[PDB]
Design a protein around this ligand. Sequence first.
Ligand code: HEM
Ligand SMILES: *[C@@H]1O[C@H](CO)[C@@H](O[C@@H]2O[C@H](CO)[C@@H](O)[C@H](O)[C@H]2NC(C)=O)[C@H](O)[C@H]1NC(C)=O
Ligand SMILES: *[C@@H]1O[C@H](CO)[C@@H](O[C@@H]2O[C@H](CO)[C@@H](O)[C@H](O)[C@H]2NC(C)=O)[C@H](O)[C@H]1NC(C)=O
Ligand SMILES: *[C@H]1O[C@H](CO)[C@@H](O)[C@H](O)[C@@H]1O[C@H]1O[C@H](CO)[C@@H](O)[C@H](O)[C@@H]1O
Ligand SMILES: *[C@@H]1O[C@H](CO)[C@@H](O)[C@H](O)[C@H]1NC(C)=O
Ligand SMILES: *[C@H]1O[C@H](CO)[C@@H](O)[C@H](O)[C@@H]1O
Ligand SMILES: *[C@H]1O[C@H](CO)[C@@H](O)[C@H](O)[C@@H]1O
Ligand SMILES: *[C@H]1O[C@H](CO)[C@@H](O)[C@H](O)[C@@H]1O
Ligand SMILES: *[C@H]1O[C@H](CO)[C@@H](O)[C@H](O)[C@@H]1O
Ligand SMILES: *[C@H]1O[C@H](CO)[C@@H](O)[C@H](O)[C@@H]1O
Ligand SMILES: *[C@H]1O[C@H](CO)[C@@H](O)[C@H](O)[C@@H]1O
Ligand SMILES: *[C@H]1O[C@H](CO)[C@@H](O)[C@H](O)[C@@H]1O
Ligand SMILES: *[C@H]1O[C@H](CO)[C@@H](O)[C@H](O)[C@@H]1O
Ligand SMILES: *[C@H]1O[C@H](CO)[C@@H](O)[C@H](O)[C@@H]1O
Ligand SMILES: *[C@H]1O[C@H](CO)[C@@H](O)[C@H](O)[C@@H]1O
Ligand SMILES: *[C@H]1O[C@H](CO)[C@@H](O)[C@H](O)[C@@H]1O
Ligand SMILES: [C-]#N
Ligand SMILES: [Br-]
Ligand SMILES: [Br-]
Ligand SMILES: [Mn+2]
Length: 299
Amino acid sequence: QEPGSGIGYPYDNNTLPYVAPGPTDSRAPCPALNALANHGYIPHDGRAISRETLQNAFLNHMGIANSVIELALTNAFVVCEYVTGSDCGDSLVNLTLLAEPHAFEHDHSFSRKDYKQGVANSNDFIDNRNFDAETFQTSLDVVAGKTHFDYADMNEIRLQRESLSNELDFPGWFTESKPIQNVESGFIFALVSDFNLPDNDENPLVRIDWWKYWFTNESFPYHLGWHPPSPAREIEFVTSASSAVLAASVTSTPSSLPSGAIGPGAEAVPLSFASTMTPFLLATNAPYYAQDPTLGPND
Ligand code: HEM
Ligand SMILES: *[C@@H]1O[C@H](CO)[C@@H](O[C@@H]2O[C@H](CO)[C@@H](O)[C@H](O)[C@H]2NC(C)=O)[C@H](O)[C@H]1NC(C)=O
Ligand SMILES: *[C@@H]1O[C@H](CO)[C@@H](O[C@@H]2O[C@H](CO)[C@@H](O)[C@H](O)[C@H]2NC(C)=O)[C@H](O)[C@H]1NC(C)=O
Ligand SMILES: *[C@H]1O[C@H](CO)[C@@H](O)[C@H](O)[C@@H]1O[C@H]1O[C@H](CO)[C@@H](O)[C@H](O)[C@@H]1O
Ligand SMILES: *[C@@H]1O[C@H](CO)[C@@H](O)[C@H](O)[C@H]1NC(C)=O
Ligand SMILES: *[C@H]1O[C@H](CO)[C@@H](O)[C@H](O)[C@@H]1O
Ligand SMILES: *[C@H]1O[C@H](CO)[C@@H](O)[C@H](O)[C@@H]1O
Ligand SMILES: *[C@H]1O[C@H](CO)[C@@H](O)[C@H](O)[C@@H]1O
Ligand SMILES: *[C@H]1O[C@H](CO)[C@@H](O)[C@H](O)[C@@H]1O
Ligand SMILES: *[C@H]1O[C@H](CO)[C@@H](O)[C@H](O)[C@@H]1O
Ligand SMILES: *[C@H]1O[C@H](CO)[C@@H](O)[C@H](O)[C@@H]1O
Ligand SMILES: *[C@H]1O[C@H](CO)[C@@H](O)[C@H](O)[C@@H]1O
Ligand SMILES: *[C@H]1O[C@H](CO)[C@@H](O)[C@H](O)[C@@H]1O
Ligand SMILES: *[C@H]1O[C@H](CO)[C@@H](O)[C@H](O)[C@@H]1O
Ligand SMILES: *[C@H]1O[C@H](CO)[C@@H](O)[C@H](O)[C@@H]1O
Ligand SMILES: *[C@H]1O[C@H](CO)[C@@H](O)[C@H](O)[C@@H]1O
Ligand SMILES: [C-]#N
Ligand SMILES: [Br-]
Ligand SMILES: [Br-]
Ligand SMILES: [Mn+2]
């Protein structure tokens, strides 16, 4: 928000306004990075981004501690070298390359289509990077008519997304990604669980309106009473939530689930790519911005 607005106070005392991305700006498949970039907490153009710039932006503007993004930083830079063909040092070339498929970006996302979702021909691909309202609605509708949801509900959401993606993706494309997805499950509990409930730290429940605002708008739901978690969330909370989602009892089983979908997931680890392997072409679509309605500087 505009610095003088005090909308962030006393949790964030140095805010900057929302500015929609223009056609030449680089955006990510990540709703967190996109929100940060839209506020200029990382470069508005989404290019040439250092580890410290990312650390500071998450910590000071989102209540996300350095521990939370340690692996994510490692993996961003692995993907940068893989896509560009050379070491990216400490300047992430852009946000867009993070949408390189079957890498950090993965299938059965909550709010993005898959790289080969519903393509008629094997060589074709689609926008697996920009926010997709229809896809996100498939996640939201698992919890239709509710204001909050728990770990068991999140397990049901990711299962619905896995089922839909396994059915709709070009045959042979679909690749299950429980470890990366469920760290992201943890990230959702970390950012938008309801801190106004007395047991939030131990038994977090996601506030659906906050989740929807964040993903749809790629900005922060201050108008709905949200603020950055204080103190900043740490990695332990995230991986615990990840475990809990995958351990939760499944009461409604979708068909067309991949083998081993139900049950615990592997620890997320650093990515690696064969030097021989050429990267998949990146979707070239202009960056998405909210248009129904468009956002003002304080939104
Ligand atoms: C340097 C730090 C980060 C990097 C490089 C990064 C990168 C990515 C990438 C490449 C994806 C796409 C995965 C996919 O859904 O196919 C993604 C998704 C996602 N990110 Fe991040 N991320 C970072 C930090 C965070 C943080 C701190 C949060 C929240 C606290 C967050 C929230 C999410 C969520 C919820 C998704 C899933 C979106 C969906 O499934 O529709 N990210 N991120
Ligand atoms: C995306 O953000 C816009 C702008 O903040 C939301 O529309 C506003 O919602 C606030 C409460 O958050 C209301 O006080 C205003 O009346 C709304 N303003 C406008 C211009 O409509 C919108 O609801 C957000 N979208 C989602 C899905 O959360
Ligand atoms: C983000 O960076 C990537 C990697 O450099 C860009 O993708 C490459 O763009 C060049 C043209 O400039 C092509 O020759 C390559 O084929 C692209 N690589 C892949 C794997 O697709 C991408 O255009 C950049 N995006 C933005 C918006 O800046
Ligand atoms: C991205 O751009 C490529 C060349 O610029 C196209 O060949 C791709 O199909 C893809 O096009 C999509 O996004 C661009 C924005 O760069 C639009 O101009 C296209 O109409 C399309 O939506
Ligand atoms: C914001 O400023 C107030 C008043 O000086 C201070 O009490 C508070 O600790 C500040 N918040 C942060 C996150 O530094
Ligand atoms: C989230 O984190 C837990 C604990 O490391 C994993 O079991 C899960 O697969 C996901 O990565
Ligand atoms: C989540 O899982 C990690 C290991 O993946 C633990 O280190 C952490 O304490 C939490 O249980
Ligand atoms: C790990 O931590 C999370 C968040 O505190 C809990 O919800 C979970 O039960 C486990 O203790
Ligand atoms: C979350 O909890 C599960 C079950 O204990 C672990 O296997 C995982 O490593 C993480 O600590
Ligand atoms: C069984 O219970 C789970 C959560 O406890 C729901 O998500 C599911 O829809 C079913 O009613
Ligand atoms: C749906 O069915 C699966 C097995 O097919 C169970 O694991 C789940 O608990 C639910 O009953
Ligand atoms: C219970 O919920 C699951 C997951 O959302 C559905 O796939 C199933 O049809 C049932 O309604
Ligand atoms: C499709 O298959 C699943 C089990 O794999 C069932 O739970 C569902 O009811 C449907 O028959
Ligand atoms: C990480 O691992 C891959 C194999 O999965 C290697 O190709 C790469 O060079 C690095 O050792
Ligand atoms: C990278 O490009 C090579 C050709 O150099 C393809 O064979 C490969 O599958 C990938 O798209
Ligand atoms: C986004 O842009 C629209 C024009 O389409 C304005 O009406 C709105 O206030 C927001 O700035
Ligand atoms: C973000 N993962
Ligand atoms: Br489709
Ligand atoms: Br797994
Ligand atoms: Mn994806």
